[PDB]
Ligand binder design. Sequence first.
Ligand SMILES: COC(=O)C[C@@](O)(CCC(C)(C)O)C(=O)O[C@@H]1C(OC)=C[C@]23CCCN2CCc2cc4c(cc2[C@H]13)OCO4
Ligand SMILES: [Mg+2]
Ligand SMILES: [Mg+2]
Ligand SMILES: [Mg+2]
Ligand SMILES: [Mg+2]
Ligand SMILES: [Mg+2]
Ligand SMILES: [Mg+2]
Ligand SMILES: [Mg+2]
Ligand SMILES: [Mg+2]
Ligand SMILES: [Mg+2]
Ligand SMILES: [Mg+2]
Ligand SMILES: [Mg+2]
Ligand SMILES: [Mg+2]
Ligand SMILES: [Mg+2]
Ligand SMILES: [Mg+2]
Ligand SMILES: [Mg+2]
Ligand SMILES: [Mg+2]
Ligand SMILES: [Mg+2]
Ligand SMILES: [Mg+2]
Ligand SMILES: [Mg+2]
Ligand SMILES: [Mg+2]
Ligand SMILES: [Mg+2]
Ligand SMILES: [Mg+2]
Ligand SMILES: [Mg+2]
Ligand SMILES: [Mg+2]
Ligand SMILES: [Mg+2]
Ligand SMILES: [Mg+2]
Ligand SMILES: [Mg+2]
Ligand SMILES: [Mg+2]
Ligand SMILES: [Mg+2]
Ligand SMILES: [Mg+2]
Lengths: 168, 104, 176, 159
Amino acid sequence: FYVPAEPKLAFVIRIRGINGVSPKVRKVLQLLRLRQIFNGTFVKLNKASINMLRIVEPYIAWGYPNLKSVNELIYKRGYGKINKKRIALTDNTLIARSLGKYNIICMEDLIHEIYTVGKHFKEANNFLWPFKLSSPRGGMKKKTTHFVEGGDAGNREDQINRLIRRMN
Amino acid sequence: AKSKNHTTHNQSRKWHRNGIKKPRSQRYESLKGVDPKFLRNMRFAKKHNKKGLKKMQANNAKAMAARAEAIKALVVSRKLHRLAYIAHPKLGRRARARIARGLR
Amino acid sequence: MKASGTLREYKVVGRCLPTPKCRTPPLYRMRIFAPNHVVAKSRFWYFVSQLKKMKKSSGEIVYCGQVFEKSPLRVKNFGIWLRYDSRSGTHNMYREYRDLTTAGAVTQCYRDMGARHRARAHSIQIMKVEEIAASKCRRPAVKQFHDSKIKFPLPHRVLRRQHKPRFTTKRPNTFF
Amino acid sequence: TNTKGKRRGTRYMFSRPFRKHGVVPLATYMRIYKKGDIVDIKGMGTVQKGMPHKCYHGKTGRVYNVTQHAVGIVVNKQVKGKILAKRINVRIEHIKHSKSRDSFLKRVKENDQKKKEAKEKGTWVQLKRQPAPPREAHFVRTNGKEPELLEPIPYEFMA
RNA sequence: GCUGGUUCCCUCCAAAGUUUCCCUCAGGAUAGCUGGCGCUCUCCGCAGUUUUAUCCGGUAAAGCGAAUGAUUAGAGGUCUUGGGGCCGAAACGAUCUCAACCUAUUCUCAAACUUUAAAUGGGUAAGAAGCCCGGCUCGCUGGUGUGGAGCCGGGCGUGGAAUGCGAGUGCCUAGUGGGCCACUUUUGGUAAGCAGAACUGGCGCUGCGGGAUGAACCGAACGCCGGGUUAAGGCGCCCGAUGCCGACGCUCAUCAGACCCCAGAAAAGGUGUUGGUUGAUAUAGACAGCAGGAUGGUGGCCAUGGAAGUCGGAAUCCGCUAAGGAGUGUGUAACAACUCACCUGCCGAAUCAACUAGCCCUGAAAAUGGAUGGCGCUGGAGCGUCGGGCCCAUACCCGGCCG
RNA sequence: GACAGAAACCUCCCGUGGAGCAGAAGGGCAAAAGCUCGCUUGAUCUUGAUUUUCAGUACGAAUACAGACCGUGAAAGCGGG
RNA sequence: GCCAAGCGUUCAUAGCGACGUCGCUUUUUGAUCCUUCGAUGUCGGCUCUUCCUAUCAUUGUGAAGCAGAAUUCACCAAGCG
RNA sequence: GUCUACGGCCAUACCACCCUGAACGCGCCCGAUCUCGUCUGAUCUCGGAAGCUAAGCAGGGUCGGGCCUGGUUAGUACUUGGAUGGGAGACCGCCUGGGAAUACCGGGUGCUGUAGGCUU
Ligand SMILES: COC(=O)C[C@@](O)(CCC(C)(C)O)C(=O)O[C@@H]1C(OC)=C[C@]23CCCN2CCc2cc4c(cc2[C@H]13)OCO4
Ligand SMILES: [Mg+2]
Ligand SMILES: [Mg+2]
Ligand SMILES: [Mg+2]
Ligand SMILES: [Mg+2]
Ligand SMILES: [Mg+2]
Ligand SMILES: [Mg+2]
Ligand SMILES: [Mg+2]
Ligand SMILES: [Mg+2]
Ligand SMILES: [Mg+2]
Ligand SMILES: [Mg+2]
Ligand SMILES: [Mg+2]
Ligand SMILES: [Mg+2]
Ligand SMILES: [Mg+2]
Ligand SMILES: [Mg+2]
Ligand SMILES: [Mg+2]
Ligand SMILES: [Mg+2]
Ligand SMILES: [Mg+2]
Ligand SMILES: [Mg+2]
Ligand SMILES: [Mg+2]
Ligand SMILES: [Mg+2]
Ligand SMILES: [Mg+2]
Ligand SMILES: [Mg+2]
Ligand SMILES: [Mg+2]
Ligand SMILES: [Mg+2]
Ligand SMILES: [Mg+2]
Ligand SMILES: [Mg+2]
Ligand SMILES: [Mg+2]
Ligand SMILES: [Mg+2]
Ligand SMILES: [Mg+2]
Ligand SMILES: [Mg+2]
């Protein structure tokens, strides 16, 4: 048997709202930059981040995104945090002026860093403004339950790609 | 007319609203509460630092000299590599100029 | 577990992580019926934790693959041994079903148990399923179909599509 | 309400462990404490002199004054919504060194040696601690034997 | 210190019912929660978080063949003592004993017991204020310029875990100091829409979609609008959406049932019906069904005025047989007599028993007429497990405008 | 082991505390914190710091020192109830 | 209401039913203090209407340790007293 | 191999019984004038060296008790977070993570520092 290397990049979406949230869960959501409902962000996976996701399991849906998912997210809803403003990535000079020090110049190698995390994944992801995603067209299954029990919360392994397609 | 006696209900929210701040820390901590004998002798040492001044400056002069003479006696692919070198504004200037001259 | 849609058969293999005590632990495989591979692996961890001294964190999934049926075009009798939690106590049960696929038989069993005992897929704990020769079947509801010259009419055909001609002028016919 | 007594509720806290009563060993007295050392507080019922209050049991502080039989240490105590760094005087039997700082000292000296060396060599060395990474791809050899099947067992009312 | 009233607009921020003290409990002072005005910096620090090390704890669990305190039952020893006796004037000489005692076991426990002992949790650390060299001062400490402390001078940047975030700091300050509710923990009480606590979130101060209706329930929090999509909940008609040729079953109620909080029911039963578990017997032809025989020792004995197979108590086996029990019952002062068990005759395929679990029924009675929301619904418009499609919130996405 | 005994006194053995430590309970303690002796008055004079309740106010109580003058012991030490 | 030791000369269950155990009711009394102190007229009797059934009698029935007579248990039943 | 003096960790070192101890040592042992202390030279103190491993002590042994450390008990008990889950309730199942303790069955039975001897 060949056991493939377990994934090192994750996509996380806030599924539930603001009202009635425990302090620890609220703090971890602030640390993951999911302050509004249907924000998405890329998280690179290690013991610490996995435990944080475990803590905030009921409030998020997360999985392993495809390269196509990365492309769709970055092109369709890609905004940059320039001068702590939300500037739309409409050309390459915006990326170059804020990230050229990391020899990532264009949209293609921004996507390459995010997909194959590389070294300056922290800086690239922090440059990326959190994605604002629409409501899931067609409808969720059950917001309040784990995906294993036929809900939507928890850890989809790779169905997050269908979720991303349906939510863009 | 009995009423409620004790409660700590909203107190965690009240405290964390302005936050639980770790106590202020400074590089130098005050000398209050230490052993009086210890403090007396330390103040004597501070008082008499002055009388050993000239020896320290002489030794420091010799040390700086000796270390001065010591230090004096001691004294991805190639395609992308070339393309990045050319695209460099200061380093690729000559290459871009040569390409322009070649296109003539 | 939620028995969503038609179930599927999954071969799931797994083992403990290599420890300094033992270079390689034994491999364990299991047949699991689940809507998809995520819940299949979840159920694998549930069952192997129940049986052996294993956990999701201290073990790893090695191969999780769907198992296709070797004869999806011949009708078969399936015997199912299972175990469920009623309102008062848990019981072992043996049941007979008759269809094309093992996964179809298992999902039919889930529907039947829900309909007849109000049991639910989380309480139901499937343990064994075997294709049974036609002479070893025990229940009349499946044995009465073991007639080579089987013959029956369709007596009372209830009208469907009763809203397309919503206001008709003919009394519908039920004999055909 | 409760009583404002000093040792209220310390019944299991200040007692000695099982079969460890009697005379206190001498290494506890013989260990030396410089100022600035990180110290764990743990009250002992055998000695009633210089005994810390029950709210500092299990806490960790920093030595600032060393005296003949006790040390003065600075510990953080949390009151309603503020934290106070306050001084206590604890006799030696209620005191230990903490190994948390020792781990850091070992790690920093090892980084220092690995930085001074392997610098003239010119190679790059990782000095930070990255967290536990996801596992890498590998093969599992089922040499010979086939993975043996598991099935749930039938219920038996062993109660 | 107690009632009532307290006069224009818009914009921004926005609480408390808690701590300590008071002849204090309908009130104040005080800390906390708020606002306003700034200032010092920035373009190293911090955190209602995880990780890597390192300590701390005596709750849940468990234990009583481990301490303390309970507590059940049998064993095996003995003269270690007492008792009921007997042979013994007596005799640890002996007999049984009953006891206490001791030794191994055994049933059940503990908020104010405990050898063990979690989960969640509480500290600390994760560097530049750090490491590494050299030299001066000391009246402290000293076998020893020993120790320790403090000063000088120089050298080391891969800023030494993850992630996120601009921080620090000073004045002046109003209102508040009746709280209430919910998941899990929990004390008093039979219990309470009762009284009292812990943690978190709400209501108060808050509108909006759903729960028909509702302060706190589920979703979601709000500038004025257009388009799209969803949450929870729904899609016979009221009423937007199944007017799908939806899938598989269960259920008939002369009181059906019909969705968190929530607005009603239990023990016990049913040959009503549907699943299942275990044990029997059946082609040497089972269960029905339609019939024959129930016979001798022996009217057996201890027994009763009389009981003979039929009221009562130990007994309760034999040859005849395909078969008959020293008898299951009916009836007699006892018989008689009939019948039941046994096995054959006819026909010929599945049949009995004990449990167990789903829906339905009995249990099930209050006062104006009556409420799955109503109508109404039974090839469900009921219950269980499921699939597509569809409906809409002030939520989410795109756009316009105001601040 | 005379009187002597259920229980007076003497001797040996076992004895982790099942005793005692003024009092309520909890903790602690065995060449001792218990028992018996010897000497004594640290239950004395003085200025600060800190802990406990806490508002980090007071009182009360307590803890480490420091400076005198003493007690005790061969001494290290211990002692300002 | 459920179980069934016993009573009922026989016989657990015609009629009862101990030791136990499960409910309903709000015509008793308690428990609480949610509404009402800038007032909702307190006990009884009289008068008058309506409603409930947990049925005393009357209509129709089933069981008795119902021969008849009288009398007990139960069912549909609040129409009329 | 081992002991003595002083120890560190304080049962893997304890307890009961049996066996063996070469050399040095450690002890038992012989006495009371002196120092010293008792009702008693028994203890303590002092002065010795005829004898002795009998004991203490060291090593070893016991299908030893105890103690230390594993397996099982057991993914059981319990528990973080979740659900418009079940149930009249009492309570229970699942998802997400963590995870014990008896009984029973094994293994082991002191390491070690400073100074000084013995093994001519
Ligand atoms: C004109 O005022 C009146 O009618 C007279 C009056 O003051 C008289 C007082 C007294 C009854 C003690 O004589 C009164 O009746 O009291 C209150 C009243 O006022 C209207 C209404 C109340 C409130 C709710 C119903 N209930 C009705 C009667 C009542 C009866 C009582 C009782 C208290 C009340 C009170 O306690 C003992 O029995
Ligand atoms: Mg909510
Ligand atoms: Mg649509
Ligand atoms: Mg919720
Ligand atoms: Mg109050
Ligand atoms: Mg007042
Ligand atoms: Mg006063
Ligand atoms: Mg008022
Ligand atoms: Mg406690
Ligand atoms: Mg308990
Ligand atoms: Mg209350
Ligand atoms: Mg108010
Ligand atoms: Mg608010
Ligand atoms: Mg609200
Ligand atoms: Mg309702
Ligand atoms: Mg709209
Ligand atoms: Mg509706
Ligand atoms: Mg916009
Ligand atoms: Mg002494
Ligand atoms: Mg002094
Ligand atoms: Mg009788
Ligand atoms: Mg009240
Ligand atoms: Mg009136
Ligand atoms: Mg009036
Ligand atoms: Mg009636
Ligand atoms: Mg002598
Ligand atoms: Mg010897
Ligand atoms: Mg010997
Ligand atoms: Mg042993
Ligand atoms: Mg040694
Ligand atoms: Mg020799």
